[PDB]
Amino acid sequence: TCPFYKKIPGTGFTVDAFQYGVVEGCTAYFLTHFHSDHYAGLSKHFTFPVYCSEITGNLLKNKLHVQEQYIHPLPLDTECIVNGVKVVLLDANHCPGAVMILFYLPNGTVILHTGDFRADPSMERSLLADQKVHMLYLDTTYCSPEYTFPSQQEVIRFAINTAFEAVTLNPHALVVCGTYSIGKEKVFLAIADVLGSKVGMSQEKYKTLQCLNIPEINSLITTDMCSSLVHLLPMMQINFKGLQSHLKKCGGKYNQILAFRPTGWTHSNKFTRIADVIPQTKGNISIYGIPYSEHSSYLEMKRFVQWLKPQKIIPTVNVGTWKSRSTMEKYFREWKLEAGY
């Protein structure tokens, strides 16, 4: 059944709750972003109002074929009334179109649901600065102090410099980047840009990218693989076997592959720096795992929450085990005692 952490009290609203069939008493289904564990269950046969960003609405229409009459896009940073309740959508700094949602309950309670987010000090100067938030529905993906990672900017710098050096030394080297969802487009776009290439990809992925309102996108991407020296492939194909295979397909246009696997966290984060990362190499193929995260580090999360000073925290991630639940509750209490709310 629909879990309690997907329900917004005092409304008939649910968040990211599309795989339980009809939810008893739900008059509006919000969708924070277009990632499959969150939209799971949506299709052309859905007949309830879906509230979301413009970009998430483009994906629902073009990729899922949800009918236009059930899609209700809202602008960001704008007070809107939905079924008699004031709401605001804020940028979540996750993937394209991802939002946080502020609900202003008739009784005076204010609730923030983060969806998936990477907390950033810039959020401290959005519309959140303007009033008190009583309850926080929090993305707790990396809520443990072992989870450190570099800035997105540091990681892109590394990838750009790595690719540029490699292709400048060998003009017959191919760059490949893995993907399995929207998110992390900066990785392959930044690399393509330094190399004066467009990025080449399948027709399904090009379609997905054309929904995201990226400026000048027609200048940056293409379905013509042969004309491009940065290819995107399914993350599943980013290994020696799938890469050797792929190399054959280009017909001796390239003799070397340099590939990037943008992971979340991996245990080498607890020892190694970004300047000190190394690839796995078999022959003329090298694979780099780069820690490009679209979720809060532990420190970023802790700073956001100690700034917000919520009265109650409801986790939305890692809630399935008693051990995780108890560990998270311990950090929340530490934060509160250190900060004095």
Chain positions 196 to 215 lying near Ni ion, rule: CB under 5 A, are none
Helix (H), strand (E) counts: the chain = 9, 18
Q: Choose the binding region for Ni ion from 12-20, 111-119, 126-134, 172-180 (rule: CB under 5 A).
A: 111-119
- Cα 102 from Cα 130, distance rounded (Å): 12
Question: What is the total count of residues that contact Ni ion (CB under 5 A)?
Answer: 2
Residue placing its CB nearer to Ni ion in the complex, 141 or 256: 141
Q: String of b and e for 271-303 (b: at least 16 CB within 10 Å)?
A: eeebeeeeeeeeebbbbbbbbbbbbbbbebbbb
Candidates 65, 74, 53, 55; CA nearest to 209 is: 55
Q: Choose the binding region for Ni ion from 30-38, 50-58, 249-257, 261-269 (rule: CB under 5 A).
A: 30-38
CB neighbours of residue 88 within 10 Å: 22
- Cα 5 from Cα 93, distance rounded (Å): 22
- Binding pattern to Ni ion, positions 60-99, x when CB under 5 A? ----------------------------------------
> Smallest distance, Å, CB 318 to Ni ion?
14
Among 35, 113, 184, 246, binds Ni ion (CB under 5 A): 35
> Smallest distance, Å, CB 98 to Ni ion?
7
Residue placing its CB nearer to Ni ion in the complex, 57 or 200: 57
Among 16, 116, 139, 300, binds Ni ion (CB under 5 A): 116
- Cα 205 from Cα 63, distance rounded (Å): 10
- Cα 292 from Cα 289, distance rounded (Å): 9
- Using CB under 5 A as the binding rule, whether residue 184 contacts Ni ion is answered as no
Q: Give the contacts of 108 (CB within 8 A, at least 6 positions apart).
A: none
Residue placing its CB nearer to Ni ion in the complex, 95 or 257: 95
Judged by the rule CB under 5 A, the positions of this chain that interact with Ni ion are 35, 116
